[PDB]
Amino acid sequence: AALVVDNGSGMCKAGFAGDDAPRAVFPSIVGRPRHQGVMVGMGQKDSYVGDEAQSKRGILTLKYPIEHGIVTNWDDMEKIWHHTFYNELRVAPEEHPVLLTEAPLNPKANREKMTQIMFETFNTPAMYVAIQAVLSLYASGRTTGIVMDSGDGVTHTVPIYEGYALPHAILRLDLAGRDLTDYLMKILTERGYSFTTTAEREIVRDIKEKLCYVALDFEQEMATAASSSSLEKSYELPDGQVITIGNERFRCPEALFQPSFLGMESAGIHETTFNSIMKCDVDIRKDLYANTVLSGGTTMYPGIADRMQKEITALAPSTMKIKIIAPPERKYSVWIGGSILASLSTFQQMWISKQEYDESGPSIVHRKCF
Amino acid sequence: AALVVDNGSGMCKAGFAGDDAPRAVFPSIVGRPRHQGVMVGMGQKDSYVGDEAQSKRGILTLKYPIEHGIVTNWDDMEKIWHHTFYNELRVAPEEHPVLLTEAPLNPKANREKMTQIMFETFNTPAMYVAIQAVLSLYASGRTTGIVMDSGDGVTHTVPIYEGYALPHAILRLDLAGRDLTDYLMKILTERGYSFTTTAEREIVRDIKEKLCYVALDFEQEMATAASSSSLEKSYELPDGQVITIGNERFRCPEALFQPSFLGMESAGIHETTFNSIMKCDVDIRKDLYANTVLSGGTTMYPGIADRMQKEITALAPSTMKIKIIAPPERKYSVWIGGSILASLSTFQQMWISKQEYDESGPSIVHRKCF
Amino acid sequence: AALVVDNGSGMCKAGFAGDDAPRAVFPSIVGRPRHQGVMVGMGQKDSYVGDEAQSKRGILTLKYPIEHGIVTNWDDMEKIWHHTFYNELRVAPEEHPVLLTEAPLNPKANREKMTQIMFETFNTPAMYVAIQAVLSLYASGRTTGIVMDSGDGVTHTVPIYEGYALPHAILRLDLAGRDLTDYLMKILTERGYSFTTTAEREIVRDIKEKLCYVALDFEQEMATAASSSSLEKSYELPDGQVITIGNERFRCPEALFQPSFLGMESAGIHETTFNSIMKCDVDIRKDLYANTVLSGGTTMYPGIADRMQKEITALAPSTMKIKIIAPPERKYSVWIGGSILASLSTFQQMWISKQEYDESGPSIVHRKCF
Amino acid sequence: QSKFRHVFGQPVKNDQCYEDIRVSRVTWDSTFCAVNPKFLAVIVEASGGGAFLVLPLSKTGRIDKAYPTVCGHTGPVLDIDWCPHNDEVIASGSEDCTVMVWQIPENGLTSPLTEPVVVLEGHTKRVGIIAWHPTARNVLLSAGCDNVVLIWNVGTAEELYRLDSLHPDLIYNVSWNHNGSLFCSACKDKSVRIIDPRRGTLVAEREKAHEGARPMRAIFLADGKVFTTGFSRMSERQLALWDPENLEEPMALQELDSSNGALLPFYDPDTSVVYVCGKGDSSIRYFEITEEPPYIHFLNTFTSKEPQRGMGSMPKRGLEVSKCEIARFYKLHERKCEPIVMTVPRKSDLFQDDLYPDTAGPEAALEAEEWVSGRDADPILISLRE
Ligand SMILES: Nc1ncnc2c1ncn2[C@@H]1O[C@H](COP(=O)(O)OP(=O)(O)O)[C@@H](O)[C@H]1O
Ligand SMILES: Nc1ncnc2c1ncn2[C@@H]1O[C@H](COP(=O)(O)OP(=O)(O)O)[C@@H](O)[C@H]1O
Ligand SMILES: Nc1ncnc2c1ncn2[C@@H]1O[C@H](COP(=O)(O)OP(=O)(O)O)[C@@H](O)[C@H]1O
Ligand SMILES: [Mg+2]
Ligand SMILES: [Mg+2]
Ligand SMILES: [Mg+2]
Numbered sequence A, B, C: 001a002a003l004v005v006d007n008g009s010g011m012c013k014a015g016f017a018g019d020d021a022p023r024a025v026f027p028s029i030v031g032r033p034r035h036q037g038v039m040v041g042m043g044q045k046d047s048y049v050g051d052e053a054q055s056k057r058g059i060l061t062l063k064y065p066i067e068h069g070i071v072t073n074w075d076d077m078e079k080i081w082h083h084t085f086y087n088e089l090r091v092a093p094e095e096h097p098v099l100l101t102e103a104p105l106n107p108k109a110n111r112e113k114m115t116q117i118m119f120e121t122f123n124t125p126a127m128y129v130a131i132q133a134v135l136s137l138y139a140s141g142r143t144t145g146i147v148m149d150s151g152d153g154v155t156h157t158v159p160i161y162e163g164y165a166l167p168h169a170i171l172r173l174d175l176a177g178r179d180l181t182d183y184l185m186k187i188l189t190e191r192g193y194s195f196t197t198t199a200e201r202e203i204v205r206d207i208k209e210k211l212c213y214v215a216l217d218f219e220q221e222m223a224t225a226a227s228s229s230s231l232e233k234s235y236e237l238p239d240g241q242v243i244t245i246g247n248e249r250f251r252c253p254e255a256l257f258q259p260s261f262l263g264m265e266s267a268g269i270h271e272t273t274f275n276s277i278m279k280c281d282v283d284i285r286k287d288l289y290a291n292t293v294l295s296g297g298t299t300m301y302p303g304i305a306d307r308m309q310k311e312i313t314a315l316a317p318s319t320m321k322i323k324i325i326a327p328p329e330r331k332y333s334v335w336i337g338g339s340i341l342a343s344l345s346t347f348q349q350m351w352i353s354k355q356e357y358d359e360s361g362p363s364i365v366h367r368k369c370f
Numbered sequence D: 001q002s003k004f005r006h007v008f009g010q011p012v013k014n015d016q017c018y019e020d021i022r023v024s025r026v027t028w029d030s031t032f033c034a035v036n037p038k039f040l041a042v043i044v045e046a047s048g049g050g051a052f053l054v055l056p057l058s059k060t061g062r063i064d065k066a067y068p069t070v071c072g073h074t075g076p077v078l079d080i081d082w083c084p085h086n087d088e089v090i091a092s093g094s095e096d097c098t099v100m101v102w103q104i105p106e107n108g109l110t111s112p113l114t115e116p117v118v119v120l121e122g123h124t125k126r127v128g129i130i131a132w133h134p135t136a137r138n139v140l141l142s143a144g145c146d147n148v149v150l151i152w153n154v155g156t157a158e159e160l161y162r163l164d165s166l167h168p169d170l171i172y173n174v175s176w177n178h179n180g181s182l183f184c185s186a187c188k189d190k191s192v193r194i195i196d197p198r199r200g201t202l203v204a205e206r207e208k209a210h211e212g213a214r215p216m217r218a219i220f221l222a223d224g225k226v227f228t229t230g231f232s233r234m235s236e237r238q239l240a241l242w243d244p245e246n247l248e249e250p251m252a253l254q255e256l257d258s259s260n261g262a263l264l265p266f267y268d269p270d271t272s273v274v275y276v277c278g279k280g281d282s283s284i285r286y287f288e289i290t291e292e293p294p295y296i297h298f299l300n301t302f303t304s305k306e307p308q309r310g311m312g313s314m315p316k317r318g319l320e321v322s323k324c325e326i327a328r329f330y331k332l333h334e335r336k337c338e339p340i341v342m343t344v345p346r347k348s349d350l351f352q353d354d355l356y357p358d359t360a361g362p363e364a365a366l367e368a369e370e371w372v373s374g375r376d377a378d379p380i381l382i383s384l385r386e
Helices: A049-055 A074-088 A106-121 A132-139 A178-189 A198-211 A218-227 A248-254 A267-278 A282-289 A304-315 A331-341 A354-368 B051-055 B075-090 B108-119 B132-139 B178-189 B199-213 B218-227 B248-254 B268-277 B281-291 B304-315 B332-343 B352-367 C052-057 C074-088 C108-120 C131-139 C176-193 C198-211 C218-227 C248-255 C269-279 C281-290 C304-315 C332-341 C347-348 C352-366 D370-371
Strands: A002-008 A012-017 A022-027 A030-033 A062-065 A097-103 A126-131 A145-150 A155-161 A169-172 A234-236 A242-245 A292-295 B003-007 B009-017 B024-027 B030-033 B060-063 B099-100 B126-131 B145-150 B155-161 B171-173 B235-236 B242-245 B292-295 C003-007 C011-016 C024-026 C031-033 C060-063 C100-102 C125-130 C145-150 C155-159 C172-175 C233-235 C242-245 C292-295 D009-010 D033-035 D039-044 D051-057 D070-073 D078-085 D086-094 D100-103 D118-122 D127-132 D139-144 D149-153 D158-163 D171-175 D183-187 D191-196 D203-208 D219-220 D224-229 D237-241 D250-255 D263-268 D272-280 D283-288 D296-305 D323-333 D336-343
Touching: A002 A074, A002 A331, A012 A074, A022 A049, A022 A074, A030 A074, A062 A198, A097 A106, A097 A132, A097 A331, A106 A126, A106 A354, A106 B178, A126 A132, A126 A354, A132 A145, A132 A155, A132 A292, A132 A331, A145 A267, A145 D183, A155 A267, A155 A282, A169 A267, A178 A198, A178 A242, A178 A248, A178 C108, A198 A234, A198 A242, A218 A248, A248 B155, A267 A282, A267 A304, A292 A304, B003 B075, B003 B332, B009 B075, B009 B332, B024 B051, B024 B075, B024 C003, B030 B075, B060 B199, B099 B108, B099 B132, B099 B332, B108 B126, B126 B132, B126 B352, B132 B145, B132 B155, B132 B292, B132 B332, B145 B268, B145 B281, B155 B268, B155 B281, B155 C242, B171 B268, B171 D263, B178 B199, B178 B242, B178 B248, B199 B235, B199 B242, B199 C281, B218 B248, B268 B281, B268 B304, B281 D033, B292 B304, B292 B332, C003 C074, C003 C332, C011 C074, C011 C332, C024 C052, C024 C074, C024 D009, C031 C074, C060 C198, C060 C233, C074 C108, C100 C108, C100 C131, C100 C332, C108 C125, C125 C332, C125 C352, C131 C145, C131 C155, C131 C292, C131 C332, C145 C269, C145 C281, C155 C269, C155 C281, C155 D203, C172 C269, C176 C198, C176 C242, C176 C248, C198 C233, C198 C242, C218 C248, C248 C269, C248 C304, C269 C281, C269 C304, C269 D039, C292 C304, C292 D323, C332 C347, C332 D323, C347 D296, D009 D296, D033 D078, D033 D323, D039 D078, D039 D086, D051 D078, D051 D086, D070 D086, D070 D100, D078 D127, D086 D127, D086 D139, D100 D139, D127 D171, D139 D171, D171 D219, D183 D219, D191 D224, D219 D263, D224 D263, D272 D323
Parallel strands: A002 A097, A097 A126, A145 A292, B003 B099, B099 B126, B145 B292, C003 C100, C100 C125, C145 C292
Antiparallel strands: A002 A012, A012 A022, A030 A062, A145 A155, A155 A169, A234 A242, B003 B009, B009 B024, B030 B060, B145 B155, B155 B171, B235 B242, C003 C011, C011 C024, C031 C060, C145 C155, C155 C172, C233 C242, D009 D336, D033 D039, D039 D051, D051 D070, D078 D086, D086 D100, D100 D118, D127 D139, D139 D149, D149 D158, D171 D183, D183 D191, D191 D203, D219 D224, D224 D237, D237 D250, D263 D272, D272 D283, D283 D296, D323 D336
16 A cells, blocks of 8 residues: 655654545654753653654754755654654555655755655655645545645645646745744734743644634724733643733734735735736636635634635636635645545556666656656 | 937836937836834935835835836836936936837837826927837848847837838737746746745846856757756855856746746747748848847847857748847847937937827827837 | 933933933842841831942842843832932933833833833823834944844844844844853852852852953863963952852853853854844845944953854855944943934934823834834 | 924824725826815725715724715816815816816715716816815816816806916916915916906916926915925925015025925915925925025924825814814825824913914805905904814
């Protein structure tokens, strides 16, 4: 059976092809102790990967080997892959083909080192790199539509019509969940809450996933939060302290639609989606309007689909039907679509075999993978 | 003394008729601050135009009032024209006739507003619109030949025989230097270089103007760049970072001859020039083959004349003599030709006087200007 | 005449706008007796503020109302403000506008209570709250540069280019002079010197200001101090005892560049300044490198400017000119810049007058102050 | 030294500003806003024809997209003006070559108003200048691109006087004098003229007041002098004070900057302070005119970060006297109207008699029939103490 590994910037999802849900889902972190161990004879490892690092984060410095969809520490990345195959899936990577995912418009050396590591370190019999947005369309059972995949590091839009992708219409933003987490940390200081360490960043990320939401009308929502305490919510820190946040619940997700909150000059996700559609041919814009698909964990805020529909409707012509497809399991759309593609009989000849890599080097991935 | 203003999509060239070179050349940009001023008592303007915006682009959002030879922001246009007359040339436009340039097959409302603005905002005594490709033939001292003018927004070919233009044979492409800037902007991500902001686009344009060239044989040049580092060049960013580019030097200009690189269905500039010649009468094709004139900044790539001659020779019959005329000052051919035209004694009667605009409105430009 | 009050975590600097130096500089402490008075008829007050508490610290418990730039005791803060206006400056606060200073990224309720106390307790006709780092740039006569202000509670960097601040690039550290003073107390125990009381902490602070310095190479300075007594210095305690310190002279300031000495996960002041520059756009980094300004009392260590230049040079590209500006009066740069700002004619429209407070409440400070 | 040396602008919060307003994009350089102590009128962009939004001052915050507007003109509206003697009557001129006078209900508009009370037709092309008579009741002045100034009796829909042989080129603006007996006008030929409408004569004229081809303004002051804004050859914006008796040389001439956009002067007779507002600028400069040289004293400048598309000045009767406010400006952005309050910082909270002299009331001194006969009366002054 094939292996499907979706390597996001923040979270690693792994499983077997043919399954409907990932078997191993854990954070994509590597933690190392920043203090001195004084207990002799108890098992201190040099580093912790995944859930163990998350549970021991009090005495660790958490590092993300993937930043903005680009691996910045390949030694740390091998640890995560080694943990995935041997500790999470508990399989031998040399016996199963591996299907990996990558964001579009990535550096070409990123997927070449991915090819070299898979074939030389893990000795995978076959390997393939797929675009995350393309895989999301597989999970929805569609051949036409524009997918706005937004995870922890990358927010990209890939429009596809009748099984054909438009590479010139692909747009990529470096604004994602991690930037929202950092923005939430900055605005939480307005209420006196100070989070600075890498471990405290994980606490704020948990706050963001539990209390944040997207406001249908940001200006009206700000007025409501400034006149009453109905929108205030409470969160309990691991040490027992209780924090309360008000307008920060919808201000942090608002940076997706207003990147100027972070000092970025780029357009919001609604305009990026609209611009990608407008870059396509006129005859296919109607189908893309009614088949807008959301993917990734960043699009999991309550009310994000209603806001996206409202924003694009104001931009698109009034005669087009704007339909935002936001399945309840869209956090795993990339993996589920990868599971479907890896099980297709017509996909078995698209694998990059060991023989092909041996006679062409790591550069073979640019010829066989889109 | 008449004024010659060549308002291209990227650059504004202005000067006096009878001169051999423009007196003022500055980028056609208008920049506005995107941050908040915190220092009081400093002479911070609301917007910056031309060179000042280029020097302060680190804290500005640069906007081009012209997109594809069409003015999309008329309010920003009056800023550039005001900057041209009063800050660059330091002359009063109400005392000098103004000769303006426009690309062929432009919207009729584009040149009507230019006529209205000149007469009502600047109160010019006389005014005229000339086709850019026609002016380039004046600079070369010719009355017969086809002019391939390629600037920042528009690439167009205008064939002229014995002083008579063939309007049915005029071809226009929306592929120009700005599209090449965006293409190099996209393909630089393959090496990990990330440029996103409008200020960073100006840096990418400077890289293109200094390191890019046209390969005589694209496929052979691909092999050479993939087998050695002899074609690699280094460029230092404003912050001191050094970047190295290889095959991207000649892949970016190749989009002119292979527009499919940008997802466009149109033919290359070599085929567009040949198609314009083929649309002409058979008895005049021989003269047009030997008098092909290049103009505009997008034709300043090294080796573009040799490539154009090689491509047109393959299309034209073997018995025709293909001669590509690429003067070293072809970046200012449009202005130089306008300088020659405005100084002719026979041209003084084709000015659109104020009395004609008053009794006919802005629509007079469609009767007196070709 | 406007009043400029720079309330840092450790020291309170007050004076009149237009002057070149503060008129009153006293410690920001409030002391209360911890014993029982047995002398009847003696002028024993309930509490002592400023120099009076410092002189009587033997029988007092010194408390700092400001901790890390955040006021933790507003009742004690009113005593210091009352002592400033009536005992130090000897003026009526209701007759002069008051300009206050605050560190960036502070809790929003901190400057709201400052607004409320100034208008309701002292009845100031007008007030304004300014960022300390922005004021330091005023004193140096520059409109472009990054200021690393390090005082007693907060170390923060604010980059400014052409009068425009980059809020997204502002970094703040909770490591400052007070943390170094506590670190010096901890490492003084290695030589048998014990300082535990609040009065003894002030003694250690005096030792730090007189004998501590920044070593150009920390590891090399370790070898020199462990091989001879050339670096050893003597200090006389108030009771006549003489203490001698060796490597502790440059170990305490080293915690600024190596925060791991205090168990902190944050980066050093050299990396924080570099990281703030890297968060800015590429076109302005060159100007920020050559205009790095040091401010605050924590930057008064001998050799800190040389060390900062050496550390930033290693991080910055070799083609950049790293220039550290460390004026000899940088301990009062925040106040001096505030004096200049409060005297500007263009600043007179930025005051928050008494009228706006009555029609807006304390929340007016968030829409009229940066 | 003056009390007006300290005047500073404080914009109101967003909740008192008026948002969601499609401000009209007409190139014509008019105020684009008319405000009285009762309503706020803003020229808006209409899909068909022309319309302007009239709303009560209380209706702050977001403005309904389908809010009924005054849509009666077949072309976009160029200028609007509230009647000084009736807060519920407004006049408007458009490119449909006609002037329509409207009656706004006390509570505002519930349905889109289309039918005007009177329709004045005397022009061949667009009318961009509308000026109510300061004293005479029901007397309105209309000036269009046809270089003719017409006096309208809105009460009877009758054209009292016609003057077409006075302007040889485009007219920029028309400003009535103090008592309404004369009016100044700036023409495209760089000439400033003072015209008596009841006699059809040219009282005074100054050719080449400014040496700039850019548009120039000219307004009448309370003392009878003319304040003009214009450009030089190098587009240097200038201010000039002219005495009608002596027009050979200006009393004062001061250069401001080299920016584009015409300077629209807002003059307050009670304070003798002119507020110079330039179209497209982000700053408002105020100057004090006195009898002491150089007769134009720069006080200060209110600065902002947003260019303004229009500007409206609220009269004295609608100002907050108890807060020492002497001017209120409704800055028009592209999609928002932001009132800006001019104030004089005063320690006392009592009434300032010096800051608020007697101002012209909403009661007309004369009527249309009496004004024709040559009768003149100064505006009826009221008190602001109440
Ligand atoms: N319920 C939620 N609400 C808001 N954000 C979420 C939620 N769940 C996950 N996220 C964000 O999505 C990011 C990662 O999402 P995902 O795409 O599933 O993984 P990856 O991006 O690592 O492939 C995380 O950084 C997290 O902050
Ligand atoms: N030496 C050069 N090499 C390649 N491209 C150039 C060069 N000089 C200018 N260009 C391109 O030409 C474009 C503008 O050329 P030009 O025709 O002179 O001005 P405009 O198109 O604005 O009239 C710019 O976008 C620039 O990218
Ligand atoms: N000469 C010096 N050398 C080292 N540290 C100093 C020196 N002078 C002052 N400091 C430190 O600076 C801190 C406060 O400095 P300053 O910024 O001027 O005041 P504040 O931080 O209260 O605004 C004190 O804690 C003190 O330890
Ligand atoms: Mg993902
Ligand atoms: Mg050109
Ligand atoms: Mg300080």
